[PDB]
Amino acid sequence: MEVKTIKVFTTVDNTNLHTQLVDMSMTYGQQFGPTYLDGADVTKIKPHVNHEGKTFFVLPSDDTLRSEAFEYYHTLDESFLGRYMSALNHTKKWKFPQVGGLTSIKWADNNCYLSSVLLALQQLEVKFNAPALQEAYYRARAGDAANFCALILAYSNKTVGELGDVRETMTHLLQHANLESAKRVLNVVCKHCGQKTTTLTGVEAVMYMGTLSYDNLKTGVSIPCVCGRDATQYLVQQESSFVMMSAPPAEYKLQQGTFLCANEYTGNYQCGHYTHITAKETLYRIDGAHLTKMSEYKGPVTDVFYKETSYTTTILE
Numbered sequence: 069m070e071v072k073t074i075k076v077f078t079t080v081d082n083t084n085l086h087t088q089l090v091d092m093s094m095t096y097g098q099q100f101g102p103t104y105l106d107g108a109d110v111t112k113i114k115p116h117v118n119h120e121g122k123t124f125f126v127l128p129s130d131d132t133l134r135s136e137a138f139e140y141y142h143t144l145d146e147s148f149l150g151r152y153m154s155a156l157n158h159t160k161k162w163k164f165p166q167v168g169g170l171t172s173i174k175w176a177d178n179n180c181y182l183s184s185v186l187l188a189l190q191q192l193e194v195k196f197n198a199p200a201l202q203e204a205y206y207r208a209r210a211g212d213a214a215n216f217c218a219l220i221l222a223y224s225n226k227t228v229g230e231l232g233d234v235r236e237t238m239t240h241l242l243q244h245a246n247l248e249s250a251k252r253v254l255n256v257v258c259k260h261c262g263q264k265t266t267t268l269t270g271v272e273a274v275m276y277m278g279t280l281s282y283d284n285l286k287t288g289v290s291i292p293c294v295c296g297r298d299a300t301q302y303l304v305q306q307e308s309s310f311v312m313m314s315a316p317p318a319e320y321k322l323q324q325g326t327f328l329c330a331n332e333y334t335g336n337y338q339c340g341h342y343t344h345i346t347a348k349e350t351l352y353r354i355d356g357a358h359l360t361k362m363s364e365y366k367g368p369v370t371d372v373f374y375k376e377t378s379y380t381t382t383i384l385e
């Protein structure tokens with residue numbers, strides 16, 4: 069007798085494993101719909117005896133599987149799992165060296181922006197609500213980052229090789245972060261329209277666009293008003309474990325002891341390359357696999373991260 073059937077497990081979350089008896093005369097596709105083995109699309113291939121006992125990813129095709137997928141990924145986007153697997157097939161071949169004491173990514177497939185995201189996240193006090201991200205994030209910190217990168221890509225709506233942006237990616241990822249108690253209060257004054265207090269929560273409490281300087285947000289920054297004037301605003305209260313300050317790329321000085329980490333962007337509107345700046349015993353520039361230690365830094369910066377716990381202004385009235 070030749071082997072005619074094998075047992076395998078199917079899954080949408082790599083936790084709940086569903087036993088299947090596979091007919092070796094049919095493709096995986098004919099039995100399960102689109103099917104993946106460690107990210108590889110095996111929809112069109114027939115089973116091999118060596119597949120016995122292995123785990124295959126499938127698409128959520130009934131209410132139980134849809135619920136498992138929602139519970140794990142925190143999205144109802146039906147294209148998600150397929151995009152995640154498509155990315156994973158490539159990211160499993162990336163290398164994740166330890167550079168400046170952090171897990172970095174050796175350059176491949178225009179992944180510099182992802183390396184900068186990964187490096188930043190390891191330095192923030194952040195956790196993810198979606199179990200897929202939290203579990204992958206833990207593994208990534210130790211150097212097993214292929215799954216985390218594939219997830220970031222899928223959550224971002226980016227494919228492997230696509231040119232990306234750190235701030236855009238962070239906006240997508242932080243939607244799944246533990247920011248429900250993050251709070252920001254801003255005092256806003258327009259000479260025409262008057263005063264108001266703006267309260268922001270979640271992602272909007274930790275991300276700012278317009279200046280790289282947390283000090284400047286504290287002391288006063290210009291912001292457009294609906295009337296056409298420039299109003300001024302300053303930070304009254306902040307409750308979060310970090311803040312991310314972003315601005316269109318420009319030359320900026322970074323001084324050890326005054327920030328957590330940052331993204332350098334060399335380039336312009338068309339094209340650019342993202343590197344990571346951090347500090348340990350001195351300033352570090354981490355460009356994928358490559359470290360440069362620095363005694364000063366003045367260069368093109370787009371995002372600066374700062375530690376926070378709780379801040380309250382001393383500006384009166």
Ligand code: NA
Pocket residue numbers: 184185187188329330331343344345
């Ligand atoms: Na960074």
Ligand code: NA
Pocket residue numbers: 199200201203204215
């Ligand atoms: Na995961």
Ligand code: NA
Pocket residue numbers: 273274275276311312313
């Ligand atoms: Na901010």
Ligand code: NA
Pocket residue numbers: 285286287302303304380381382383
């Ligand atoms: Na302030």
Ligand code: NA
Pocket residue numbers: 172173180183184187342343344354355356
């Ligand atoms: Na990097």
Ligand SMILES: [Zn+2]
Pocket residue numbers: 258259260261262293294295296297299
């Ligand atoms: Zn106004």
